[PDB]
């Protein structure tokens, strides 16, 4: 009985879902708990994710 116990280690230990919004280009410091996508201060204020319960990444 064999098994594909082969894989590569994942280094980093740092968040990446807080880069920059490709819309307003603002430091992503919030995450829409309604769309499940990282957003920026502008996005949150934007009616787009304004009504959505956004949280501080
Ligand atoms: Zn934005
Ligand atoms: Zn949203």
Question: In whole angstroms, how far apart are CA 46 and each of 6, 10, 53?
Answer: 46, 36, 12
Say how many Å lie between the CA of residue 1 and the centre of ligand 1: 52
Domain boundaries, the chain: 1-57
Question: In whole angstroms, how far apart are CA 22 and each of 5, 48, 56?
Answer: 39, 15, 18
Nearest of 18, 43, 36 to residue 28 by alpha carbon: 18
By what method was this entry solved? NMR
Q: In whole angstroms, what is the distance from residue 24 CA to residue 7 CA?
A: 38
18-44 in b/e form (b: 16+ CB < 10 A) is: eeebeeeeeebebbbeeeeebbbeebb
Q: In whole angstroms, what is the distance from residue 2 CA to residue 10 CA?
A: 24
Say how many Å lie between the CA of residue 11 and the centre of ligand 2: 30
Classified as helix, coil or strand, 51 is coil
Determine whether domain 1-57 maps to CATH 3.30.160.60.
Answer: yes
Say how many Å lie between the CA of residue 22 and the centre of ligand 1: 7
Strand runs labelled E in the chain? 30-32, 37-39, 54-55
Q: In whole angstroms, what is the distance from residue 7 CA to residue 19 CA?
A: 28
């Amino acid at each position: 009985g064999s098994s594909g116990s082969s894989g590569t280690p994942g280094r980093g230990s740092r968040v990446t879902d807080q880069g920059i919004c490709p819309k307003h280009q603002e430091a992503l410091k919030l995450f829409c708990e309604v769309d499940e996508e990282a957003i920026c201060v502008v996005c949150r204020e934007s009616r787009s994710h304004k009504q959505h319960s956004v949280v501080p990444l």
